[PDB]
């Protein structure tokens, strides 16, 4: 509820002599909540003593709406205080320390086959490369060969070992659109039924057993 329920609400005057009152319930309910007097007058008059449109016209033309001289200043101040009081009244109604950090080092990955080498002879092999690449000369011809290139292309050739699969079948045309919609609807039904089924789970009371039997 806002205090602008009267200031913002104005008699809508159209281009040529049109009183578009547009008496929405939202404004009327706001006035009734803020001003129970308007509600009482409407209940005691509309539509017997006067019609609803007649009552609204009276309210527009009444001196209570057009409040606009010490008496006038006092009346304005008192009305503002009463309005504020009505608005206010209507407004009423953990430190953590890990233990096993290694679990993060080997998380959801299971134990790999980290096979270790043999005795210190691996060092000799480590020496071998250390001696093999110690005296190194760049090479160009030895990098690739025509046979190697042909084999690589054959592996990369479409339909090849690396080129697995390819074009597939248009299942969209194999399934009629009406059948597609019916399948979607049956899927929705099955999903709702299974959601009801698993909603009972986990079973802790006998009532869940009977409900699951009904669902089955």
């Amino acid at each position: 509820i806002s205090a602008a329920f009267l200031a913002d609400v104005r008699p809508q005057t159209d281009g040529c002599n049109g009183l578009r009152y547009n008496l929405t319930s939202d404004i009327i309910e706001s006035i009734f909540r803020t001003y129970p007097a308007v509600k009482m007058k409407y209940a005691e008059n509309v539509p017997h003593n006067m019609t609803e449109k007649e009552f609204w016209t009276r309210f527009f033309q009444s001196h209570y709406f057009h409040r606009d001289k010490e008496n006038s200043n006092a009346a304005i101040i008192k009305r503002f205080n009463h309005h504020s009081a009505m608005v206010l009244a209507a407004g009423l109604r953990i430190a953590l320390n890990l233990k096993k950090s290694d679990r993060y080092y080997h998380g959801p990955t299971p134990i790999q086959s980290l096979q270790y080498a043999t005795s210190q002879d691996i060092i000799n092999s480590f020496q071998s490369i250390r001696q093999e690449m110690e005296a190194y000369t760049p090479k160009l011809t030895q990098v690739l060969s025509s046979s190697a290139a042909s084999s690589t292309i054959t592996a990369l050739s479409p339909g090849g070992a690396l080129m697995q699969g390819g074009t597939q079948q248009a299942i969209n045309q194999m399934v009629p659109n009406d059948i597609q919609s019916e399948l979607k609807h049956l899927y929705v039904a099955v999903g709702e039924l299974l959601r009801h089924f698993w909603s009972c789970f986990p079973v802790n009371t006998p009532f869940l057993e009977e409900k699951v039997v009904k669902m089955k």
Partner: protein, 261 residues
């Protein structure tokens, strides 16, 4: 105004390459380094506005790598060749740590990307992508930091491409899935360079029109902490987010008793 930065991260685990040298296979680490340098040269070759950032991820630490040949390209390559030999000659294994410092290298790359982006002229936009090649085994403990890196990259919208040689890592799969990057395992390591060029080199906008291999399916199963076993539905702690398969009155991790009547 298209400032394209191609970040290269290399699995520089000495153990895997030492074993491969023991195998005397067709592919060696020198070939991988040459392929990386060629890819970077092509990246800078495509456009002047393109920039290159190469960081080597070694077990000890992460190193910032950067005659008929292009002079600037020659200088950059000789710098990179100097850097890798400098690291390898000083590459001393001192400790039992074997997992590659994958997360730290990614963090350094992200910081460098942020620094360059701040230095980017406002008249131009900087698209950034990170390419990582995987050779050795994946790292276990870095999971939290790896996830943090993924989240930060997705926040800054940086594509991350992972290239597998021998060992598949589901962490890289999930990282490429979340970041939108391309993930693929190369069986023929000597042919690996072409897979970089045919797939990783083209930009994402270019990849749109191009026909690409279909993405690999990625799973997101969860392991219950008390046994690290994958499950479908589990009980999650409301305090420390720990996962428990069996109902418990007290949480083991955050030491909180569950107030259930």
């Amino acid at each position: 105004d298209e400032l394209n930065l191609l970040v290269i991260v290399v699995d520089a685990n000495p153990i895997w390459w030492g074993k491969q040298a023991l195998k005397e296979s067709q592919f060696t680490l020198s070939k991988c380094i040459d392929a990386v340098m060629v890819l970077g040269n092509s990246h800078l070759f495509m456009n002047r506005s393109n920039k290159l950032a190469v960081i080597a991820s070694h077990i000890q630490e992460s190193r910032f790598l950067y005659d008929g040949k292009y002079e600037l390209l020659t200088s950059a390559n000789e710098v990179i060749v100097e850097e890798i030999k400098d690291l390898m000659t000083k590459s001393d294994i001192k400790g039992q740590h074997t997992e590659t410092l994958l997360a730290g290298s990614l963090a350094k790359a992200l910081c460098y990307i942020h620094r360059m982006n701040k230095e980017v002229k406002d008249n131009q936009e900087m698209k950034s992508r990170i390419l990582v090649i995987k050779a050795a085994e994946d790292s276990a403990l870095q999971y939290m930091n790896f996830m943090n890196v993924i989240f930060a990259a997705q926040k800054q919208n940086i594509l991350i491409d992972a290239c597998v040689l021998d060992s598949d890592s589901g962490l890289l799969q999930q990282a490429c899935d979340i970041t939108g990057g391309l993930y693929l395992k190369v069986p023929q390591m000597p042919s690996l360079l072409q897979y970089l060029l045919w797939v990783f080199l083209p930009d994402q906008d270019q990849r749109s029109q191009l026909i690409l291999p279909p993405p690999v399916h990625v799973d997101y199963r969860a392991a219950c902490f008390c046994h690290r076993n994958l499950i479908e539905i589990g009980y999650v702690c409301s305090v420390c987010l720990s996962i428990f398969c069996n109902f418990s009155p007290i949480c083991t991790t955050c030491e909180t008793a569950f107030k259930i009547s």
